[PDB]
Amino acid sequence: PVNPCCYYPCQHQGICVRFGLDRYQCDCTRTGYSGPNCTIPEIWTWLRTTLRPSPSFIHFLLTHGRWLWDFVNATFIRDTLMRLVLTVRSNLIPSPPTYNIAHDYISWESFSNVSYYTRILPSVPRDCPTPMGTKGKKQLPDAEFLSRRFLLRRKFIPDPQGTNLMFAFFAQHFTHQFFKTSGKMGPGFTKALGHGVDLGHIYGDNLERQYQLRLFKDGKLKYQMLNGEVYPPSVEEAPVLMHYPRGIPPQSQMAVGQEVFGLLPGLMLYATIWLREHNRVCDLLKAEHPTWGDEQLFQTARLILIGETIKIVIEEYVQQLSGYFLQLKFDPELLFGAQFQYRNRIAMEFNQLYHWHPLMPDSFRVGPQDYSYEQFLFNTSMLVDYGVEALVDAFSRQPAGRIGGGRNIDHHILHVAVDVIKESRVLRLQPFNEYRKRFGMKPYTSFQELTGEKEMAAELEELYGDIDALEFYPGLLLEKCHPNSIFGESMIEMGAPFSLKGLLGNPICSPEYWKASTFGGEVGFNLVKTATLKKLVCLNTKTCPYVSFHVPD
Amino acid sequence: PVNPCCYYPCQHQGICVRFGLDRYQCDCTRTGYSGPNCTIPEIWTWLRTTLRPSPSFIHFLLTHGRWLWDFVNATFIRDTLMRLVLTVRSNLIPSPPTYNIAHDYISWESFSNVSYYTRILPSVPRDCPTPMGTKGKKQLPDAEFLSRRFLLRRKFIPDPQGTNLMFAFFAQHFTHQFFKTSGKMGPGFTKALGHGVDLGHIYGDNLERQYQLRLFKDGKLKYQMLNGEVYPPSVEEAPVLMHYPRGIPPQSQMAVGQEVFGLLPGLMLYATIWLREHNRVCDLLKAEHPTWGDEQLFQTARLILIGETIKIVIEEYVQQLSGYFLQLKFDPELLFGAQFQYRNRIAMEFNQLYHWHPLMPDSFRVGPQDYSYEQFLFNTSMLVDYGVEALVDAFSRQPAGRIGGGRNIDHHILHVAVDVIKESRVLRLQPFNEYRKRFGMKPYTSFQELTGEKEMAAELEELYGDIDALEFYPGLLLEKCHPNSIFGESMIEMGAPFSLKGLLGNPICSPEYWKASTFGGEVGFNLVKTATLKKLVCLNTKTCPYVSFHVPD
Ligand code: HEM
Ligand code: HEM
Ligand SMILES: *[C@@H]1O[C@H](CO)[C@@H](O[C@@H]2O[C@H](CO)[C@@H](O[C@@H]3O[C@H](CO)[C@@H](O)[C@H](O)[C@@H]3O)[C@H](O)[C@H]2NC(C)=O)[C@H](O)[C@H]1NC(C)=O
Ligand SMILES: *[C@@H]1O[C@H](CO)[C@@H](O[C@@H]2O[C@H](CO)[C@@H](O[C@@H]3O[C@H](CO)[C@@H](O)[C@H](O)[C@@H]3O)[C@H](O)[C@H]2NC(C)=O)[C@H](O)[C@H]1NC(C)=O
Ligand SMILES: CC[C@@H](CO)NC(=O)Cc1c(C)n(C(=O)c2ccc(Cl)cc2)c2ccc(OC)cc12
Ligand SMILES: CC[C@@H](CO)NC(=O)Cc1c(C)n(C(=O)c2ccc(Cl)cc2)c2ccc(OC)cc12
Ligand SMILES: *[C@@H]1O[C@H](CO)[C@@H](O[C@@H]2O[C@H](CO)[C@@H](O)[C@H](O)[C@H]2NC(C)=O)[C@H](O)[C@H]1NC(C)=O
Ligand SMILES: *[C@@H]1O[C@H](CO)[C@@H](O[C@@H]2O[C@H](CO)[C@@H](O)[C@H](O)[C@H]2NC(C)=O)[C@H](O)[C@H]1NC(C)=O
Ligand SMILES: *[C@@H]1O[C@H](CO)[C@@H](O[C@@H]2O[C@H](CO)[C@@H](O)[C@H](O)[C@H]2NC(C)=O)[C@H](O)[C@H]1NC(C)=O
Ligand SMILES: *[C@@H]1O[C@H](CO)[C@@H](O[C@@H]2O[C@H](CO)[C@@H](O)[C@H](O)[C@H]2NC(C)=O)[C@H](O)[C@H]1NC(C)=O
């Protein structure tokens, strides 16, 4: 017969389990629901559900009435909510992890083979009628067409919140620590073990590689001097696998710890920023700690930057993204009261949802100059010709695409979005609406309801046949935005839990790690605590330019 | 000058940090103490310390007055204490981990390179005057002599608590999951990634190896039929690295997942027991779940046995070891209230303290027959000639050495204890008395106080010069026992936290994992919950013999 699990009968996180020839059962353990499918609510659950406001409403409360928020921020309520935000959001993510591409059930292998992404919902069983469960047509909308029609940039739609390329690239740099999908093993698998903010894009994803980059004196990273300015070394001084155009592969060529940053100037830019940071830090340690070995100076500088990364990410990055009036606060001691696992494992759906290409503009403006994609991609010289100050200034001033809402990827990078849909189909990712459910939301009942506009709605409806069969990635980028947001409801609510668990699940946030000692004393500790995009830039430059995650005025 | 940290100035878990040319500072963050060395107690700490009874006293309460305990066990207090036991004990161990052989300071590498054991206290800095801090002679007592004199069995001292070889071997089997010290990388390093009860001694420490053992039908492990009895397959049917005497390396040769079990008959015995278990379980799954793949049947059987292992370990193993009247209880839901990290990382000191060779007897009695060490070690045929029932019966009936108290390793295996002291010295393990401190105890002020007997006391005293300089491993095995115990104060108090954190830090204990679903439903779940040494034996045999962790009457 039909695999019963193809109907996704078990609700509210209950686990579908096949029995006998053709039966199923749900595991409602700890779901707050009981009954055949986990839909009869417990005493308290039912109180919560009635008294739960909508994601939209909360969003509104947070984006409105600064008078109340200026007061809140000023008091401890800032910490009370920050804690709330941290615990309720985190909690929706399995820790320790659950599944992967091979196992649609907890297993020792899935727990211990750190080479996999995890997954939050299982796969569509291989044996289902329609390719995504029980509804839709047999064939699914042709990837290519789907993007052409709904994701291809018509005219440039700027992000309504003032988000800049200075942000965009940081977004890319940063994420590419833990998105390193494997060429050799294939989709579902990751080179970026560590699965978090390990800075394995500065330090390399392996010790052999990291060892090529280390200067081994005073625990510094290797570098080179071009125009009296510090930059990463060449592969001539640091042999190590870097994907680059063969052509000028010695000098001009650079090595960084993420084998892909050689490509776009904005990547190498941040790589330069952080390297200058690493060494600047060491300088301040060796000051304090003459007796310290090179190894210690290295490992400790690392920890500083890891901490520094997470502060900026939370208090600058996510602050800007969210457009909140609640002033976000990075402070691990907030979670010492709570029950939190200090471990992280990158999920595939996360991989899928962080494909923020729409941010990317039509061209790249550097003061008077205006560079084509053709001119910008692979530009081996652009970083060193312009100088970090002038490039930071540049990106800080140029806008970026409203991520969600649709029709907003520039045609150059459109094929990436196509491949994402292609692998989505390879990974057997469940229907969008099923993910809506798992992240607490109500599933959509129409395409018109998904994106509040008839044209795309009816056209999608015709293509997919059914809203339930609407795929995950399309779902995310086509959904209507809240008023004046970078993206819509489903992006926030599925994005948050992954992001926060990534950030706070880091061991350095742990009670065990989060001490002055661990960052070599107060100067270390306060470097983390007083971290700032503007500091990470200007402390490492001769000049201090415009540096921000939003365009001026 | 002298590295200030060689005095171990920072108390109560405060972290010594070198500053400038010759200064130090303590990191008393969250120690419950403040002041220069972390010795000025906080308001509550001071209340706890006054109101803390001695380890000895508690031990007495637990081993005495069954009338009170028969009542306690019968009520919920059994769970209240079991929880207490679990939380207070666990807590003394860093999670996430701290150091390793390379780093005497938290680092990303030490956090993420799972190839190391961790360590609870740092090393003796390389630059200290005496080889163990500031006291003792320059040279340390000659390993060989130290064992000859104090650890070599005179006459056999049986364990006063009735502990048998049936226990002894389980102890060895079990532990050798997570003690797999690496030949190639050297001391400080481990083949046994997983760092816990992963059953990587049944399933192998790698997927390539595990794949050689799997039958790949109905998710069973490969096997062979000798005398109508099931046993592990030969290397002819399962090629895979097994350390064995070259000689009869085809048939007669066996493969198991731990490359060392080929040696002693009691190891292969348990290997046989668990393999029979694995397949017996699969049989019961395939019954329920016809549609299930081979992969699922395999991963799930695993989880059952992992759970089954931990129940028996806690409720039978540690029960017997402890001689408690409080009836220990394996129940993960006990910790869902608490703040617990569901991760484990095997420490070196743990490695060091679990060298329970003294358990091993003078010879091996199998009913009428009496086998020399010469006859027992490497006996390729002994398992299959005798039959598991008759061998279980045998070990269940023969005693075992009082582990602590001294002078109790049989001369055959004495060199192991020598090597342990040798690597202790390689790993730069801190003084015994420093470990006493870190595990809450008061340091010893005399050798006479360590083992309450003048002869060994004054002789040690002369050899080591100072109690502070007394090494870790000697300390553990020479210390006086509580009345009628298998070992003394320091073994329990340093052993417990590691053991419980190993057991309960397992992901399957997690809220996220601990569901009927995860073990494929109620039959799975109850297999874990109703687990028993006696079941693990008799359900897999034609006959049911004497099977117990203690000798009869
Ligand atoms: C001009 C700038 C950019 C270019 C040229 C670009 C291009 C690409 C390419 C070629 C791929 C790989 C396609 C594949 O493997 O199928 C990719 C994937 C990806 N992109 Fe972009 N992208 C840009 C900006 C961004 C931004 C702003 C983000 C948002 C943080 C981002 C995040 C990602 C991620 C996370 C992946 C998948 C990585 C993995 O699975 O390992 N990229 N992009
Ligand atoms: C006749 C039985 C036994 C023999 C012949 C034996 C012998 C040995 C040998 C040869 C070593 C390795 C020496 C070295 O690498 O320096 C060793 C280490 C060890 N033994 Fe025993 N032993 C026996 C029983 C036990 C028992 C009852 C236990 C207690 C659980 C035990 C636990 C260990 C452990 C945990 C190690 C270190 C493993 C590692 O670092 O990987 N053994 N023993
Ligand atoms: C966990 O850490 C250990 C030890 O740090 C890593 O193993 C070791 O890796 C290094 C570099 O890969 C090897 O060092 C040697 O140094 C010279 C310096 O020029 C190098 O050129 C030589 O080729 C040589 O390999 C070392 O041999 C190797 N072995 C050990 C145990 O020291 C291990 O790779 C780490 N584990 C993981 C998975 O990262
Ligand atoms: C994590 O899991 C992956 C996938 O299970 C492991 O990689 C894969 O390992 C297997 C066995 O080592 C390879 O399978 C192939 O199967 C045939 C069957 O006879 C075997 O004889 C061939 O030699 C062949 O290798 C497979 O190639 C390999 N690659 C992948 C990604 O599938 C990986 O080893 C695991 N990671 C760790 C560290 O355990
Ligand atoms: C909808 C458009 C605007 C609102 O005007 N942006 C957001 O809501 C972005 C956002 C918030 C608020 N996240 C938090 O849940 C969050 C924000 C701040 C703190 Cl402190 C904690 C969580 C995210 C977590 C992850 C994420 O990427 C995947 C985006 C977000
Ligand atoms: C001193 C001799 C007798 C007492 O007569 N044995 C013990 O005390 C052994 C013992 C107890 C009690 N452990 C618990 O702390 C323990 C026991 C039971 C539960 Cl449920 C939890 C912890 C150990 C944890 C680990 C361990 O090996 C390293 C031994 C032990
Ligand atoms: C739980 O869900 C299952 C499957 O989704 C339900 O079975 C369906 O019953 C509904 C209404 O009673 C019908 O629409 C279908 O005929 C059934 N579908 C399938 C696939 O079997 C089941 O009724 C639910 N459990 C209960 C008892 O409410
Ligand atoms: C990559 O960028 C570099 C430097 O940014 C380009 O060289 C400059 O281009 C501008 C206008 O495009 C001109 O003024 C000059 O030809 C160059 N700079 C000056 C003032 O000398 C280069 O052409 C680009 N290469 C690629 C890959 O397109
Ligand atoms: C903390 O410990 C250090 C070092 O162990 C103390 O320094 C010692 O002071 C004691 C008594 O005052 C003397 O025995 C030694 O002369 C000192 N030893 C060393 C190695 O310096 C220090 O006094 C303690 N901190 C305080 C202020 O109580
Ligand atoms: C290993 O053990 C086997 C079987 O347990 C030994 O063979 C038996 O030894 C007993 C007495 O030692 C004798 O009755 C026989 O010689 C054997 N069994 C019978 C009844 O046939 C064997 O000698 C041992 N080998 C080693 C490694 O010493």
Residue type, A156: F
A258 in the same domain as A218: yes
User: B323 and B361 in contact (C-beta within 8 Å)?
Assistant: no
Rounded alpha-carbon distances, angstroms, from residue B194 to A109, A116, A441, B303: 10, 16, 36, 14
B87 and B198, same domain (yes or no): yes
Task: Give the CA diameter of chain A.
Answer: 74
A176 in catalytic set: yes
Strand-pair partners of A25: A17
CA atoms within 13 A on the CB side of B82: 24
- Please name which of B536, B540, B469 lies closest in space to residue B130, comparing C-alpha atoms: B469
Residue whose tokens read 């990712």: A429
* Structure tokens that stand for A369 in this block: 């100059």
| Residue in the structure block whose two tokens are 């398992």 | B383
Tell me whether the omega of the peptide bond preceding residue A96 falls within 30 degrees of 0, making it cis: yes
Q: Are residues A12 and A64 in the same domain?
A: no
Q: Where are the beta strands (DSSP E) in B217-280?
A: 224-226, 229-231
Mutate to test the interface with A, among B106, B339, B514 (most CBs of A within 10 A): B106
User: Residue B506 belongs to what H/E stretch?
Assistant: none
Among A169, A1, A59, residue whose Cα is nearest residue A480: A59
Contacts of A119 in chain B (CB under 8 A): none
- A45's tokens: 């659950």
Distance from the Cα of A288 to chain B's closest Cα (Å) equals 5
Query: Best mutation site among A12, A27, A37 for ligand 7, i.e. most ligand atoms within 8 A of its Cβ?
Result: A37
Report the C-alpha gap between A202 and A278 in whole angstroms: 9
Is B357 annotated to bind a ligand? Reply is yes
AA identity, residue A264: L
If you search the block for the tokens 């009981």, which residue do you land on? A34
* Ligand 5 atom 13: residue of nearest CA: A496
Contact: B103, A296; criterion CB under 8 Å: yes
**B360 and B318 co-located in one domain:** yes
Q: Which residues of B238-266 are buried (b: 16+ CB within 10 A; e: fewer)?
A: bebebebeeeeeeeebbbbbbbebbbbbb
Regarding whether B77 and B10 lie in a shared domain, the answer is: no
Please tell me which of the candidates A20, A96, A507 has its beta carbon nearest to residue B512: A96
Residue labelled with tokens 């204490």 = B81
User: What is the C-alpha radius of gyration for chain A, rounded to an integer number of angstroms?
Assistant: 24
The verdict on A305 and A374 lying in the same domain is yes
Pocket test for ligand 9, best of B2, B7, B11, B15 (most atoms within 8 A of CB): B7
CB-based contact A201:A261 (threshold 8 Å): yes
The maximal CA–CA distance of chain B, rounded, in angstroms, is 74
C-alpha A495 to ligand 5 mean position (Å): 7
- Does the CB atom of residue A74 touch ligand 4 within 6 A? no
Are A35 and A163 found together in one domain? Answer: no
| Euclidean distance between CA atoms A277 and A307, whole angstroms | 13
CA torsion, points A123, A125, A126, A132, in degrees to nearest 10?
A: -70
- Bin B404: left if φ > 0, else alpha if -120 < ψ < 50, else beta: beta
Residue showing tokens 């990388």: B185
The Cα of B478 is separated from the nearest Cα of chain A by a number of Å equal to 32
Taking the C-alpha atoms of residue B227 and residue A540, their distance in angstroms, rounded to an integer, is: 76
Q: How many CA atoms lie within 13 A of B203 on its CB side?
A: 25
Q: Answer whether A57 contacts ligand 3 (Cβ < 6 A).
A: no
Q: Using CA atoms, how far apart are residues A163 and A395, in angstroms rounded to an integer?
A: 10
> Which CATH number fits the domain that encloses residue B29?
2.10.25.10
Distance CA B26, CA B5 (A): 10
CATH of the domain at A493: 1.10.640.10
Q: Which of B108, B291, B513 sits opposite A96 (nearest CB)?
A: B513
CA distance A153 to A414: 9
Q: Which of A173, A176, A482, A550 is catalytic?
A: A176
Closest CA to A259 of A198, A301, A213, A222: A213
Instruction: Tell whether A193 and A260 lie within a shared domain.
Output: yes
Q: Which residue has the tokens 């600064």?
A: A66
| Residue pointed to by tokens 């995860």 | B518
Task: List CB contacts of B320: < 8 A, sequence separation 6 or more.
Answer: B161, B163, B167, B549, B550
Torsion of CA A235, A241, A247, A248, to 10 degrees: -10
Can you tell me the distance from the alpha carbon of B163 to that of B159, in angstroms, rounded to the nearest whole number? Answer: 6
Q: Which domain holds residue B482?
A: 43-552
B66-69 contacts, C-beta under 8 A, 24 or more apart? B66/B325, B69/B325, B69/B326, B69/B327
Q: Are A505 and A342 within 8 A, CB to CB?
A: yes
CA distance B408 to B417: 11
Q: How many CA atoms lie within 13 A of B197 on its CB side?
A: 28
Contact A108 B306 (CB under 8 A): yes
CB contact under 8 A, A341 and B338: no
| Same domain? B7 vs B79 | no
Q: Ligand 1: residues within 6 Å at CB?
A: A 168, 171-172, 175, 179-181, 264, 351, 354-357, 359-360, 413, 416, 419
The contacts of residue B335 (CB under 8 Å, 6+ apart) are B83, B86, B87, B504, B509
- Alpha carbon separation from A80 to A84, A167, B241 (Å, rounded): 6, 28, 56
Contact A189, A116 (CB under 8 A): yes
A299 and A399 part of one domain? yes
The total number of residues written for chain B in this structure: 553
How far is residue B204's CA from residue B213's CA, in Å, rounded to a whole number?
A: 8
Check if the beta carbon of residue B307 is closer than 8 Å to that of residue B515.
no
- Counting from 1 in the atom list of ligand 1, the atom nearest the Cα of A356 is 29
d(CA B380, CA B265): 8
Is A546 a catalytic site residue?
A: no
Q: What distance in angstroms lies between residue A316's CA and the mean position of ligand 9's atoms?
A: 45
> How far is Cα A262 from Cα A246, in angstroms, rounded to an integer?
12
Q: How far is CA B365 from CA A50, A316, B544, in A?
A: 70, 72, 19
Start-to-end C-alpha separation, chain A: 63
Kindly state the tokens that stand for A103. 């196992």
Residue B16: alpha-carbon gap to chain centroid: 29
User: Resolution of the deposited coordinates, in angstroms?
Assistant: 2.7
> Is the CB of B515 less than 8 angstroms away from the CB of A300?
no
In one-letter notation, the amino acid at residue A416 is V
Give, in order, the Cα–Cα distances in Å from A456 to each of A156, A480, B304: 18, 11, 50
Question: Shortest CA distance to B371 belongs to which of B357, B354, B385?
Answer: B385
Spatial CB neighbours of B105, under 8 Å, sequence gap ≥ 6: A296, A299, A300, A517, A518, B99, B122
What the block records as the tokens of B286 is: 């395939």
For ligand 7, say whether the CB of A9 is within 6 Å of any of its atoms: yes
Closest CA relative to residue A496, chosen from A195, A52, A89: A89
Do B314 and B347 belong to one domain? Answer: yes
Q: Say which DSSP state A315 is in.
A: I
Whole-number Å distance, alpha carbon A318 to ligand 5 midpoint, is 6
User: Within 10 A of B63 (CB to CB), how many other CB atoms are there?
Assistant: 18
User: B246 and B353: one domain?
Assistant: yes
Phi, psi angles (nearest 5°) of residue A201: -110, -5
Instruction: Quote the number of domains for chain A.
Output: 2
d(CA B38, CA B203): 46
Contacts of A291 in chain B (CB under 8 A): 3, 18, 21
The three-state secondary structure class of B126 is: coil
How far separated are the first and last CA of chain B, in Å rounded?
A: 63
- Secondary structure class of B113 (helix, strand, coil): coil
Contact B382, B265 (CB under 8 A): yes
